Amino acid sequence: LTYKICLIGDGGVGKTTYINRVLDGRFEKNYNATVGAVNHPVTFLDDQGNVIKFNVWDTAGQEKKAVLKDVYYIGASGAILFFDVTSRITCQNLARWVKEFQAVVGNEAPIVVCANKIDIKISKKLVMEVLKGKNYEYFEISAKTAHNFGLPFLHLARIFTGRPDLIFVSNVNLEPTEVNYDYHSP
Numbered sequence: 001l002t003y004k005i006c007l008i009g010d011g012g013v014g015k016t017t018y019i020n021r022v023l024d025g026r027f028e029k030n031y032n033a034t035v036g037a038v039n040h041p042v043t044f045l046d047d048q049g050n051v052i053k054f055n056v057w058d059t060a061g062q063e064k065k066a067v068l069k070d071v072y073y074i075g076a077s078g079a080i081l082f083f084d085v086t087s088r089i090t091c092q093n094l095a096r097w098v099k100e101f102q103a104v105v106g107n108e109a110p111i112v113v114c115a116n117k118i119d120i121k122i123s124k125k126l127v128m129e130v131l132k133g134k135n136y137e138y139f140e141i142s143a144k145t146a147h148n149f150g151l152p153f154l155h156l157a158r159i160f161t162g163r164p165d166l167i168f169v170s171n172v173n174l175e176p177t178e179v180n181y182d183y184h185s186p
């Protein structure tokens with residue numbers, strides 16, 4: 001079962017730190033220069049023996065100075081939207097990120113919100129107000145230490161399969177790739 005997922009959120013919030021791990025393997029990843037994105041395949045086996053593959057797109061840093069192309073979003077089944085709990089700007093732009101994603105994919109596709117860098121803070125209240133009170137499934141994570149790495153994917157698999165009791169029975173390779181694919185940004 002295969003789903004495209006977009007990572008979104010301001011530059012510096014930890015998107016690349018989160019995803020840029022070995023996962024299904026370095027060689028399996030792909031780069032698309034037209035879009036400015038790397039695909040990271042991550043496969044989990046569930047409790048009923050289904051193979052669930054997420055093709056998780058990450059930017060090469062262009063969000064720092066520019067708007068992402070529609071092709072980044074097109075075909076996505078879901079998004080993981082990050083902010084940095086130590087920076088209010090990143091929280092403020094959450095509604096803008098949601099609108100940008102939904103403007104291409106529509107309002108049904110699940111968006112999971114991750115409060116990142118909880119290891120280092122912006123209250124969840126501020127998130128709720130920036131987002132006009134709309135509910136999104138919400139996790140506190142540390143992309144650095146991989147704390148709670150699986151939770152957004154577990155939620156997404158449940159939505160997509162319709163099985164609220166779906167669990168992952170395989171463990172993912174969480175080693176950092178040591179591959180820097182980011183464009184230099186002065």
Ligand SMILES: Nc1nc2c(ncn2[C@@H]2O[C@H](COP(=O)(O)OP(=O)(O)O)[C@@H](O)[C@H]2O)c(=O)[nH]1
Nearest residue numbers: 010011012013014015016017117119142143144
């Ligand atoms: N302390 C801490 N730093 C993080 C975490 N995730 C990312 N960073 C740092 O934040 C900076 C931006 O990370 P990056 O993954 O490039 O963010 P992106 O621009 O959203 O892809 C880097 O210096 C990372 O080391 C985290 O969970 N904790």
Ligand SMILES: [Mg+2]
Nearest residue numbers: 015016059061
């Ligand atoms: Mg990045």
